């Protein structure tokens, strides 16, 4: 059995288990699927009871498949191809969308940040500088060391516990052996 | 046991050995009469249970976020009375006990009790409703220890 | 049926589905499966969010499934495990 | 006496709150909490 051939195999059993008709299927993380997994989805969505897709998008269509240069370029046209099968099987769908914002209520630059991204021309930040830091290094020893005491800085003076930090890497081969 | 061979869920190899008489000897029992006589029952039913890191470890504390314990039920079944957590084991007992099975009973029972006290909690968290009864079915010898 | 959940990051959609799963755990803990669809690299960590209930403190009728995952059980359920399968080497 | 002098002495003899549960395994088995 070729090691790609479970969701293949998944597949064509999903309308053969009885486990799976009653259930509820909640899919999220994902940016796109490959067409194997597309195959498990849209036999979930014709053998499961019900099933929600969360998608991190701004206001996908269905229509038509988004623009290349479009920030939302993979979810969307993810969205158009899910929405597509689910029309095409004449599921009854129900659409919701968070036009608030949740994660950032507390910080104003990230949510500035994160609303301004794709922005073109940006809009300039007037407000204090506090939550969001560009910081410059000699090398990639000096990074690491000073974001060392950076961490040390906000467990010891600004009650963050060591899970509360992410570091992340494009090329985490660059600096894993040193970090 | 060909349906199951058939549809490959047990391969072959597995389904040369197998003691059907074993098998079927379970159900003759009164726990596993309960078990086909009951109002509700499920099976291979996986858990995940969060337990505050202090009971595994000591000096921890409540901010200290919980360890994730995990396991597989065996089996869970409802009668009009309540709900009974069932295990099997393929645990050797009539070949080296003095007492048999009298032996094993005592040592048995101590070498699932933490076992059973983790799942006793997880179904009792979990779902909040108490279980009334937890059986050990033991292939061999057909016995059933209760807990 | 089907619910197309859409938002920026930041929009709240998976704590919103941490949180529904775990009211329905509340509402029926033996109630119809629930499967948690997820990348294998974002397994474990849903597995501990939903975990983290005062109300019930784990889950049973609702677990975190990866695609792979997902196959092991229902092929489980369905047959076909028997053959042996290849590594990439 | 310098100024840092404090600073420098609460620092030195910090210690993380949750030092102990820092290595401490988040998934554990059935099986390995009876080990
Ligand atoms: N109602 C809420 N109020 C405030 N913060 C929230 C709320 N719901 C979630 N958060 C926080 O928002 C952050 C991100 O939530 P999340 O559920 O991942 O949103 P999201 O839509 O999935 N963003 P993303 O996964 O990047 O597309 C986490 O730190 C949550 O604790
Ligand atoms: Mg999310």
Same mark, same amino acid.
């Given at each position: 059995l070729h090691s790609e051939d479970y969701l293949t195999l998944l597949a064509e059993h999903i309308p053969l288990a009885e486990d799976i008709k009653g259930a509820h299927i909640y899919v999220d993380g994902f940016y796109q699927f490959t067409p194997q997994e597309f195959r498990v989805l849209e036999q979930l969505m014709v053998h499961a009871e019900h099933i929600t897709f969360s998608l991190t998008a701004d206001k996908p269509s269905y229509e038509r498949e988004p623009h290349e240069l479009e920030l939302f370029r993979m979810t969307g046209k993810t969205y158009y191809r899910l929405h597509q099968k689910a029309k095409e099987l004449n599921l009854d769908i129900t659409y919701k969308e968070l036009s608030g914002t949740e994660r950032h209520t507390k910080t104003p630059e990230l949510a500035h940040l994160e609303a301004?991204?794709?922005?073109?021309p940006a809009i300039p930040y007037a407000e204090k500088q506090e939550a969001l830091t560009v910081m410059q290094a000699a090398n990639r020893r000096a990074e690491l060391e000073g974001i060392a005491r950076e961490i040390h800085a906000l467990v010891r003076e600004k009650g963050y516990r060591y899970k509360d930090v992410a570091i992340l890497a494009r090329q985490p081969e660059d600096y894993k052996d040193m970090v | 046991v060909h349906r199951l061979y058939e549809k490959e869920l047990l391969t072959e190899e597995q389904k040369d050995a197998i003691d059907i008489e074993e098998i079927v000897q379970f159900f003759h029992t009164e726990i596993g009469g309960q078990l086909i006589g009951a109002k509700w029952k499920d099976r291979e039913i996986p858990f995940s249970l969060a337990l505050p890191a202090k009971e595994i470890y000591?000096? !921890?504390? &409540? !901010?200290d976020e919980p360890l994730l314990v995990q396991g597989i039920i065996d089996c869970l079944y409802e009668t009009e009375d309540g709900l009974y957590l069932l295990a099997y084991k393929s645990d050797?007992? &009539?070949?080296?006990?003095?007492?048999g099975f009298e032996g094993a009973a005592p040592i048995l029972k101590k070498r699932y009790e933490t076992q059973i006290q983790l799942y006793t909690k997880a179904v009792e968290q979990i779902a909040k409703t108490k279980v009334k009864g937890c059986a050990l079915y033991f292939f061999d010898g057909g016995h059933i220890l209760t807990l | 049926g089907a619910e197309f959940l859409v938002g920026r990051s930041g929009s709240g959609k998976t704590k919103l589905i941490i949180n529904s799963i775990q009211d329905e755990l509340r509402r029926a803990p033996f109630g119809k499966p629930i499967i948690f669809l997820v990348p294998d690299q974002m397994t474990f960590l849903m597995e501990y969010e939903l975990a983290k209930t005062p109300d019930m403190g784990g889950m049973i009728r609702a677990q975190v499934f990866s695609f792979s995952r997902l196959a092991w059980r229902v092929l489980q359920h369905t047959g076909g495990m028997s053959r042996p399968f290849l590594t990439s080497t | 006496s310098f100024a840092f002098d404090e600073k420098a002495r609460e620092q030195l003899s910090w210690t993380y709150p949750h030092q102990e549960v820092t290595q401490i395994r988040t998934k554990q088995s059935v099986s390995e909490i009876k080990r």
């Open positions: 301004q991204y794709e922005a073109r | 000591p000096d !921890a504390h &409540e !901010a050797r007992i &009539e070949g080296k006990f003095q007492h | - | -």
